[PDB]
Each structure stands twice: as C-alpha cells, then as structure tokens.
Ligand binder design. Structure first.
Ligand SMILES: [Mg+2]
Ligand SMILES: [Mg+2]
Ligand SMILES: [Mg+2]
Ligand SMILES: [Mg+2]
Ligand SMILES: [Mg+2]
Ligand SMILES: [Mg+2]
Ligand SMILES: [Mg+2]
Ligand SMILES: [Mg+2]
Ligand SMILES: [Mg+2]
Ligand SMILES: [Mg+2]
Ligand SMILES: [Mg+2]
Ligand SMILES: [Mg+2]
Ligand SMILES: [Mg+2]
Ligand SMILES: [Mg+2]
Ligand SMILES: [Mg+2]
Ligand SMILES: [Mg+2]
Ligand SMILES: [Mg+2]
Ligand SMILES: [Mg+2]
Ligand SMILES: [Mg+2]
Ligand SMILES: [Mg+2]
Ligand SMILES: [Mg+2]
Ligand SMILES: [Mg+2]
Ligand SMILES: [Mg+2]
Ligand SMILES: [Mg+2]
Ligand SMILES: [Mg+2]
Ligand SMILES: [Mg+2]
Ligand SMILES: [Mg+2]
Ligand SMILES: [Mg+2]
Ligand SMILES: [Mg+2]
Ligand SMILES: [Mg+2]
Ligand SMILES: [Mg+2]
Ligand SMILES: [Mg+2]
Ligand SMILES: [Zn+2]
Lengths: 98, 129, 217, 96, 25, 87, 125, 207
RNA sequence: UAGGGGAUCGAAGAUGAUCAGAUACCGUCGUAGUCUUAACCAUAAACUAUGCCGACUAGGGAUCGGGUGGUGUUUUUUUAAUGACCCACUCGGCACCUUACGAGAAAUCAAAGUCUUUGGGUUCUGGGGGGAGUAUGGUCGCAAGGCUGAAACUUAAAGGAAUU
RNA sequence: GAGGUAAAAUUC
C-alpha cells in the first residue's frame, strides 16, 4: 500500500519537472527522485600530501578541491553502500546522519 | 456557492457543542433562523443571542448553555401531512417524551407539538433535541 | 482471606461504601474484583463463544483459546470480559475476572408513558467496535428483545425487557459484535436528556470524608 | 450530499439512474431478457419430461474420486440434449 | 501472465481476425 | 423519570461537568474533581468545607482545564482581573 | 572471556550496603569473613563474591558509586545537601542592590502598584 | 473570598524579579495561555508577576484541606528540580518521586513502587509526560509548572514559570512550600517572613 | 502523411561473449525514431490511485507573492527616498511537523473530520471472481486504433489491510 | 568535511 507520503520524490503539485541520468548505470530518473551526494574531495589523497610538499617549488600553495554533483538511482544507491533500508518508524527521520 | 444559509448556520452550532464552545458566530443568517433560534430559546436548548447589525447580512452570537445534543437540518423542505408527522418523529428523534421536529406552517416556524394543537402543517426545516 | 491494597478496597471490607452506585458517581476505577462481589452477590456468569486462536511458529503451531464471558444481574448491571489463555477451562476463569472490573450501569426508561416499572431504554444509542454498529431502539411493552441470540442474552442479563436492535457490518463475529453493544448500553448515561437540567451541587467523594480508614494503615 | 442529488424537483434523475443501475443484479437481468425463456432449456418451468438417450459415467471433480452415474436426456418440448442425475443409491438399474 | 502482454496478445488477435473477415466480404 | 405515585425509580442521577455542562459517565477515567478550601483570617483552613469543582475528561483531552478553571473560580469571587472575559 | 553472573552481583550488593564496617579492601579479610556471616554453599561461588566486593571497595574511596548506598552516604550526603550558603544569596540584592529591570519589565511593576527599586537598562535588537 | 492579606507583597516581588521568573519563552508560544503581556524584544516574552503569584495561591489551596498529608506526590525528572522535591517531603507529608518515574506506579498495584496519590505536582510537562499520561487513567488532578511553550494537555490550574535557568524553578518551590505551611498554621503570622533562608531550595552542581 | 534536418542516443536487424540452449541481460555497429514546419492520432501508474463549489472544526515552526506598522539594521553624497534584511500582523499559495476530540477494516487522514445522535448544492462511476474490455452493431481515424459494449458458459472464492 | 564495487546458479 501507500508506505510513503510523496511516495517517490520531492514533487509537491507540479506533475513533471526534469528527467536526469544516473552516473552508475545511466538510468533515466526525475531530478527530485534521484538522491544527491555532493561528494566533495581533495584533489590529492591524505598520503600524497607529504611527497607533494617536498616536490613543490612554491613556498605556500592552496590545495585545490575537486567539487562534483552526481546523482544515483534507487537501484544503484542500495547495492552500493550509500543508503540502507531502515525501520518503519525511522523512515520519518529526514536529518542527515552525523 | 451558498445554497442553504440555515444549514450553514447550524453546522457552526453543532461543532460548538462537540468542542465545547459556549458561543458561535453565524453568517449570512436570515430571519428564518431568527424565528428558528427563538424555538430553541423557548424550550431552553440555547440561551440569549444577539443579532449584530451591519448593512449586509448581520451576524449572531448565540450564548449556549451546553444543554444541546444536536440541532440538525432536513434538506430539502419536504411537504408534511398531518397523518405523516408520526413518520418524522419516530425516525430522527431519540425518544417519544422529548425531541422537537420543527416544521414551517402558515403560522410560522413552529415545532410539531404545537402543530398538533393548532391543527396545521406545511414544510419541514430540521430537528432539535 | 483477602488483603486489599487499593485505597478504595479498604472501604469495601470496612463497610463504609454500601452500594455500587456510590462508586459510579465519582468515576472511581475498579482494579480488584473482590470489590463488586461483596456489594452485589447476585451476578451470574455466562460464556458466549470459545474459539481457538493460533500463532504460527518455527517448530509446529502454537494455539490458545479465547473466552468471551458476559456477567451481570438485572436492574441495570452488566460486565464484559474477554481473556485468552492456553486452556479452555483456564480462560473462562479469568474471563469472569475482567468482566467483574468492567461493570457499567445501564439507564433504562419508558417508551411513551411514565406509568411505572421501567422496561425499555430511554433514548436511541449506538456503539461501534470495529465495523459492527448496534443501534439500540426503545420498544413498547412486551415487545421482547429483538436481537441476535448472543446480543439477546447480554440484554437479558441487563434488566432490559423490551428493545429493538439494528445491525450493520460483519456481525458474524462475536468479538466485535458484543463489544459494539457494550459501548451502546454505556452511552445511555452519556446523552443529555431533559428533566435532568437541574444542577446538583456536586457531593463530596467518599475518599475525602472516609479517609481515616482509607489509608496505608 | 453523498453524491446523489437532493433537489425538490429532481425525481426524474433519481428514477433513471436507478434503471441504469438495475442492470448489475442477477435477478433483474434474468427476468427481462428472457434468459429463463430462451436459454436454460426449461421454458420458465419447474419440471419437464424427456427421453433417455444414453447413460453417463461422469467422474466427480477433485478432491473426490467417484462416478456419479448420470444419464443423457433429450427433452420433448424443446428437443435439447440435457444431462441429468439420479439422486439415489442405485436407481440407474431401475432406469433404461 | 502480465496484463500488458495479454493485452498485446488480444491486440494482434484483432488484426488477424478482421483481416480474415475483410477477405470474405 | 418518575411515575404515577411516589417511587423515584431509576436512580443514579450522574454528575455534570462544571465547565461544558456535559455528563461525566462511569468509565470516563480522565474526569477530575477539584476540592478548594474555604479559608479565613489567621490561618484556619477548616478541612471539611470544600468548594467542589468537577471537570470532565474532554476538557483535559482538549487541553483547556487550566483555562476553564479560571472562569469557574473568578465568578465565585476568589480571583481578580487575571482571567479576562474579553479576548 | 569471563563475565560474572547476576547472583554474584546480587549478593555483593547485599554485602556492601550493610557491612561497610568490619570489611576493608583486602581480599583475605573479605574471604574468611563470608564463611560465617553468609551461607554460601560452595567455595567457588564464595570466592567470586568476595572477588567482586574487593573490586568495588577499591572504587569507593576513589569516587562515588552510583546506585549503591552503604548506610554512610545516607548520613554524609544529607549533612552535605543542607549547604545553606551565607548572605551572598544571589536573590537578596546586596551587591548592586538596585534591580536590573528592563523596559517592558518596568511596565509590569507599575501595573501591579508596588514600589520597588528599578534600574532601567535598554536591551538591543 | 481573600480579603486583604493574600495579595502580592513587595518583600516577595524582589525574589521573583531577581530569580528571572518573569522571563517567558522563545519565539514558540502556546495560544492556549493568555499570559503574554509586554513582550520584550529578541523573541522573548514576559510572564506576569502579578498573575504568577495569584495562580500560585490556588495551587497551595488545593494541597490544603486534604485529610492525608502524604498523598501529594511531586514528580521531578529534570536535573534542575531534583533537590526542590526531596525537601518538599521534609515539611509536608508529601512523598516524592525523583529521577525515574518508574512507570506502572499509578496503575499496576502489584509493584513495590505503587503509589496512589490525590494531587500530582509536576515540574515540567515535557519531561514528566508519563506522570500526566498515567494520571488520566486513575483520576488524579495534575498541577504543573508550565512554561509558555509547554504543552497544556491533561493538566489543571498551572503556574506560569520559566525552565531555562538555574534559579527560576527552585524559588517557585520555595513559594509553594511556604504557603502550605502558612495554611495548616504552624507559623501564625504572615507579615513576618518564614524562618529559614530560600537558598536551600536550589540545585547544587556536583563540582 | 508530406518537406527540411539527420551531432548523439538508438524499437528492427547484423555480429562478440556468457549459457545445457540465449532469437536476451552485457560489448560493438546501425536504420526507423529522437529535432522542426504543415497536418492527423488522441491513449498513460494522464496518480495526490483521493470530483468541484460553500461553511465549520487544532495547535506549532518555516517559505513564496502582495500589502500595512516599526524607539529597527545596513547601503549614504549633507540628513534623506528607495532596495536588501530584521520584528510584529494580515490575506492568497506549495507544503510540512506534532497530535486524535473525530473518521476508517486497518495502513493511515486537518482531511478520507463535522455519518445510525445516519439530509449544504451538485456531476460521474461501481454491485463476487472469470469469460470481456472479448463478440456483434454503430461511429471516428490515412493506418495502428479510440469511444459505446453483451451473451452462452464456468467457479466459490478472488481481493484489501495487518500480525506471527 | 572524503575513505570500493557486479561471473554462472534451471525444475520437484
Ligand atoms: Mg510492496
Ligand atoms: Mg504526470
Ligand atoms: Mg475458522
Ligand atoms: Mg502452524
Ligand atoms: Mg450467535
Ligand atoms: Mg460494466
Ligand atoms: Mg448481486
Ligand atoms: Mg415448444
Ligand atoms: Mg411439443
Ligand atoms: Mg448432453
Ligand atoms: Mg488460465
Ligand atoms: Mg480475393
Ligand atoms: Mg538519424
Ligand atoms: Mg537484436
Ligand atoms: Mg549466439
Ligand atoms: Mg531476431
Ligand atoms: Mg544485444
Ligand atoms: Mg482512460
Ligand atoms: Mg505519482
Ligand atoms: Mg483513474
Ligand atoms: Mg492551522
Ligand atoms: Mg479528530
Ligand atoms: Mg477508533
Ligand atoms: Mg459482478
Ligand atoms: Mg470502456
Ligand atoms: Mg467493436
Ligand atoms: Mg465494430
Ligand atoms: Mg493519412
Ligand atoms: Mg473500428
Ligand atoms: Mg457469473
Ligand atoms: Mg471446494
Ligand atoms: Mg512479515
Ligand atoms: Zn544507477
């Protein structure tokens, strides 16, 4: 039955907004239905920052960060450990886990 | 839009009896409700009420004593014979010893116990018990 | 023999509370079944339906027995208690007990004449447990309890001689049918009837003036 | 107003939309169109009369396993071949 | 079976049936 | 509820709520009765002379037993302009 | 590897709450005293009780033990709980004797009619 | 019916204004409480001192004229009000329940913590919500020290207080314990103040 | 259907693997199509699976659009006026959170509430599961199809919510 | 505030 409220997405009185494509399996999905992960990262790892400071010719240098916004479908966000199935009462928690 | 003012003025009263509000505020109440509220005021179901007067329709604040179970409306206004008041006072009244199915005769808006004494009939509006 | 621990239970053995209708005034809860036994020994037990309830388990199939017990004498006193247990005879022993704690008075009146000996209900009441709605309608004299034979015995043990009933929903079950009529008989006092508009000045509870014996000692 | 009209001059809508909804019963459907008269080979009757053509060995449906010893009866007033049953413990020998 | 492929089963059943009907008229 | 001669039959006239004028029935376990003392000068509460305020279980479930007690105690004469009739 | 059961912790709770005298944090005086003052059937469960009372007597002088009152915190905390500090009361104004009363609070004082010392400090938005 | 004596004294108004009892709640505000009067800016409100004192003498008037003095159980699970309810039993009978409420106490007559009181006094309706819920089954009047944002369901006459500071709760218990000792007369005089210091009813940190 | 476009993706189809078989999933290539003009068709899980109009019933925090008040803040050239923002209030929104007096078979619902203490106005649809969204007839369309729409016969269960 | 991951597996 109706286990949710909006039941698939974050559309409140629009009908149709925008289809987007997944990054893992190229699945077409609405934009508010696909979950989002702003996977911000450094351009180098934590182990490659020691050897880069010795090889740098610069006295001081600001480390760049590779920013990217990439979406997931429902089927490739559960196989990959991104989201998990929760209990019936803990579905309502919309806060990000810290 | 609005079709029955008397039906929209009793729903504010019945919701006040359930929630416990001692007063209502009804609009666009006519003088049909004025001759109707005086029926309940004579029998003691409501207290005093004050028709305020703006030029448009007026509003009424009915001070209620809390002694009212439900005052309803019968839509539309069916024609009632003298030999058919027993059908209405048995279906939608809880007991025989009380309850007032009011019905508009040519003498005015009037309960059925006075229509037996005056030997007149007419159209029905609602029921008070 | 029996040692009360409830504050109301010590006023029962001492004898300060005589009638049950004094407890019904102040909505006092009854948590021990010895309270309304020493004040009215005239109650009669009656079982209505004993059906097996089952739970699916890993190794085998676990089962229990549900007992529906309706107690109560005449003059407007009933009680409904439903208790499940692992046996049949053990379920009806504790089915009486819950029915002793669930005693509620029934207001009966007249049909259309205040002549004497009230036989029928006063107003039309309806209870709803589950899907079953039981519409109790007052009947004239000698009309009989026009109801289901499970609902009839609950009304024969109620002091009601004559009543008209209407039902709606799946009334073949007796779990929700008997509880729907049990709400309906309790709604007789919960209806504003005229000639009750006089205001009594709220008498003092028996736990206030008999608080010397109703204590820990 | 619970879907249905409640107008004081609206008895025509309440008597046509019943007739548009009486075609959902079974009893109202079999009576007007003559289903008992045209099909169901007894022509609106309770009993009839026929001639045995042959005997049957109709096996009972699952989960039971039996032979019900039926017969084939051709009617007289219609001429339709209708299967028939013998509701006793061995009156098939009593019939030919 | 699936209610869509029963629908297309009856859909190609219609085209095959009215083609035989149209060549006998 | 009486008859032709004597015989006050069908007893247990139930309690009525002092706020909403509704009948407090038997199995209404959320009902609350308030006992208020009659005090005078120099102490002397005199236990036994109560001011009984009975409230039903609907007012507490609605959440207005704090406000319904302000109306029923000021008109007796033991408050002042704390509770305003105008709102 | 090894976790004590409840019945060891039940009897050890019964010993500490009433035998805080005649027992110290040494094991050998906690072992030979349970031979008479308690009725323990076996030696193995007897040493496990005395081995756990000794573990709890070590953490009494270090800090308070929660959920266990040994008939001496019943006396030493009640004489501590009535602290009754001196005239620096933080309600009776002795330091900055005039009361810090805001603008809307000053209107509440004149509404009830009483005469009090008021120091007006305007709060910002 | 209270002629001249039971009004607000200026010797007690300095205690309420200095203990921050007149400070209200945040931007959240319950419509059911008509106690908002001259709200100070930055979102806060001002609780009426003249209305707090008068809703406090009705709370102590119900505690009086009860035959058993021990059936008035104060409930406190808040850490700021644990000390102010144990000393409420040192002066009245008034057996307290502090810390955990151990539910099944108003019902469940089998357990060893089964208390059957007559009047339950509540520090805060949010944290002591089990005491309010179980009192609706066994017919107990409930008095609570409700803040302006506290829920007001299943509670009787309440005293508008603040529960955000260290000194706002404990001085209200000092006023409730004093008025139940002026009534049931042990101190015959009301003009002279009560014997001991009001610092005894304030919670102490473990440090 | 008839022109223009035809970069990608790509129903058909050809191949490479996997597989007992693999006309598939996966890999590669590639039409029709995706784009547009001029016409047709007009069905979707066209769903909020919840007709529309009107009234009443409950608290709370946000936000969009407009407006009104500030002992307001900031931008400032000489103080301004605007704009942005804050606070308070009020309409019209998309909604949400906590609750149950109420409603429901339950999941749940400020509405599915004010409904046996069953009548505000009004339109449409449904009457056990199949056979049937099939047959025939009429009509529309270039076609695929859309709308309207049974019977014979067969079965006693199908189905919903929830618990273990 | 970032921290790994896809072979095949049909029936009673
Ligand atoms: Mg599912
Ligand atoms: Mg759509
Ligand atoms: Mg069965
Ligand atoms: Mg089993
Ligand atoms: Mg039966
Ligand atoms: Mg059909
Ligand atoms: Mg039928
Ligand atoms: Mg013939
Ligand atoms: Mg013939
Ligand atoms: Mg045949
Ligand atoms: Mg099949
Ligand atoms: Mg040809
Ligand atoms: Mg192309
Ligand atoms: Mg292919
Ligand atoms: Mg191949
Ligand atoms: Mg192929
Ligand atoms: Mg392929
Ligand atoms: Mg459609
Ligand atoms: Mg959808
Ligand atoms: Mg649809
Ligand atoms: Mg709202
Ligand atoms: Mg509700
Ligand atoms: Mg329910
Ligand atoms: Mg059918
Ligand atoms: Mg169709
Ligand atoms: Mg056709
Ligand atoms: Mg055709
Ligand atoms: Mg064409
Ligand atoms: Mg066609
Ligand atoms: Mg059929
Ligand atoms: Mg069968
Ligand atoms: Mg399951
Ligand atoms: Zn994916």
């Amino acid at each position: 039955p109706k286990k949710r409220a909006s039941n698939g997405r974050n559309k409140k009185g629009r009908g149709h907004v925008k289809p987007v494509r997944c990054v893992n399996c190229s699945k077409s999905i609405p934009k508010d239905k696909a979950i989002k992960r702003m996977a911000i990262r450094n351009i180098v790892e934590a182990a490659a920052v020691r050897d880069l400071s010795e090889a740098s010719v610069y006295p001081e240098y600001a480390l760049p960060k590779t920013y990217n916004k990439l979406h997931y479908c429902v089927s490739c966000a559960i196989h990959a450990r991104i989201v998990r199935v929760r209990s019936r009462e803990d579905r309502k928690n919309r806060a990000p886990p810290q | 839009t609005r079709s029955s003012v008397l039906a929209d003025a009793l729903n504010a009263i019945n919701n006040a009896e359930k929630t416990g509000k001692r007063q209502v505020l009804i609009r666009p109440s006519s003088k049909v409700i004025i001759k109707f509220l005086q029926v309940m005021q004579k029998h003691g179901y409501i207290g005093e009420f004050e028709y305020i007067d703006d030029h448009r329709s007026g509003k009424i604040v009915v001070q209620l004593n809390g002694r009212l179970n439900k005052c309803g409306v019968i839509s539309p206004r069916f024609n009632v014979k003298i030999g058919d008041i027993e059908k209405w006072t048995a279906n939608l009244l809880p007991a025989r010893q009380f309850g007032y199915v009011i019905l508009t005769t040519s003498a005015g808006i009037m309960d059925h116990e006075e229509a037996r004494r005056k030997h007149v009939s007419g159209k029905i509006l609602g029921f008070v018990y | 023999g029996w040692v009360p621990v409830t504050k109301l239970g010590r006023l029962v053995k001492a004898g300060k509370i005589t009638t049950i209708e004094e407890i019904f005034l102040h909505s006092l809860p009854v948590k021990e079944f010895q309270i309304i036994d020493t004040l009215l020994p005239g109650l009669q037990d009656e079982v209505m339906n004993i059906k097996p309830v089952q739970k699916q388990t890993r190794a085998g199939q676990r089962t229990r027995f549900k007992a529906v017990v309706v107690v109560g004498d005449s003059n407007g006193h009933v009680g409904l208690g439903i208790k499940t247990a692992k046996e049949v005879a053990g379920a009806i022993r504790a089915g009486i007990i819950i029915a002793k704690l669930s005693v509620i008075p029934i207001r009966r009146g007249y049909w259309g004449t205040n002549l004497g000996q009230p036989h029928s209900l006063a107003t039309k009441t309806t209870g709803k447990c589950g899907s079953v709605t039981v519409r109790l309608i007052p009947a004239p004299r000698g009309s009989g309890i026009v109801a289901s034979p499970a609902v009839k015995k609950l009304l024969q043990l109620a002091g009601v001689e004559d009543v008209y009933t209407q039902s709606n929903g799946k009334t073949r079950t007796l779990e929700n049918t008997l509880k729907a009529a049990f709400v309906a008989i309790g709604n007789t006092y919960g209806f504003l009837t005229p000639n009750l508009w006089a205001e009594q000045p709220l008498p003092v509870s028996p736990l206030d003036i008999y608080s010397d014996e109703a204590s820990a000692q | 107003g619970k879907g249905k009209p409640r107008g004081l001059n609206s008895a025509r809508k309440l008597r046509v939309h019943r007739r548009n909804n009486r075609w959902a019963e079974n009893n109202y459907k079999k009576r007007l169109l003559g289903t008992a008269f045209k099909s169901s080979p007894f022509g609106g009757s309770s009993h009839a009369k026929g001639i045995v053509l042959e005997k049957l060995g109709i096996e009972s449906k699952q989960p039971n396993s039996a032979i019900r010893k039926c017969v084939r009866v051709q009617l007289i007033k219609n001429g339709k071949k209708v299967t028939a049953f013998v509701p006793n413990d061995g009156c098939l020998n009593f019939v030919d | 079976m699936r209610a869509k492929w029963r629908k297309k089963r009856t859909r190609r059943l219609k085209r095959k049936r009215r083609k035989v009907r149209a060549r006998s008229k | 509820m009486e008859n032709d001669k004597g015989q006050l039959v069908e007893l247990y006239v139930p309690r009525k709520c002092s706020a909403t004028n509704r009948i407090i029935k038997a199995d209404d376990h959320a009902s609350v009765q308030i006992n208020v003392a009659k005090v005078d000068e120099e102490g002397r509460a005199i236990p036994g002379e109560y001011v009984t305020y009975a409230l039903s279980g609907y007012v507490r479930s609605r959440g207005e037993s704090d406000d319904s007690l302000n109306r029923l105690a000021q008109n007796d004469g033991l408050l002042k302009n704390v509770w305003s009739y105008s709102r | 590897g090894r976790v004590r059961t409840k019945t060891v912790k039940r009897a050890s709770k019964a010993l500490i709450e009433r035998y805080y005298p005649k027992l110290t944090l040494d094991f050998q005086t906690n072992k030979r005293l349970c031979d008479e003052i308690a009725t323990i059937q076996s030696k193995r469960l007897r040493n496990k009780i005395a081995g756990y009372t000794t573990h709890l007597m070590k953490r009494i002088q270090k800090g308070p033990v929660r959920g266990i009152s040994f008939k001496l915190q019943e006396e030493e905390r009640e004489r501590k709980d009535q602290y009754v500090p001196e005239v620096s009361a933080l309600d009776l104004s002795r330091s900055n004797g005039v009361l810090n009363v805001d603008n809307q609070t000053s209107d509440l004082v004149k509404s009830l009619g009483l005469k009090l010392p008021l120091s007006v400090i305007n709060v910002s938005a | 019916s209270l002629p001249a004596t039971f009004d607000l004294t200026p010797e007690d108004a300095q205690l309420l204004l200095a203990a921050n009892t007149h400070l209200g709640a945040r931007n959240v505000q319950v419509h059911q409480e008509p106690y908002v009067f001259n709200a100070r800016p930055d979102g806060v409100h001002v609780i009426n001192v003249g209305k707090t004192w008068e809703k406090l003498v009705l709370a102590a008037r119900i505690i009086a004229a009860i035959p058993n003095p021990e059936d008035v159980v104060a409930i406190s699970s808040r850490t700021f009000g644990q000390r102010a309810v144990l000393k409420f039993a040192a002066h009245t009978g008034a057996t307290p329940i502090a810390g955990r409420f151990t539910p099944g106490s108003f019902t469940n007559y089998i357990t060893r913590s089964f208390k059957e009181p007559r009047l339950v006094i509540v520090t805060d309706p949010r944290s002591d919500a089990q005491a309010i819920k179980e009192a609706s089954y066994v017919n107990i009047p409930v008095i609570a020290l409700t803040d302006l944002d506290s829920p007001s369901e299943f509670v009787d006459v309440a005293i508008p207080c603040n529960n955000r500071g260290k000194h706002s709760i404990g001085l209200i218990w000092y006023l409730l314990a004093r008025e139940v000792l002026r009534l049931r007369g042990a101190l015959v005089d009301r003009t002279q103040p009560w014997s001991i210091m009001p610092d005894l009813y304030f919670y102490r940190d473990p440090e």
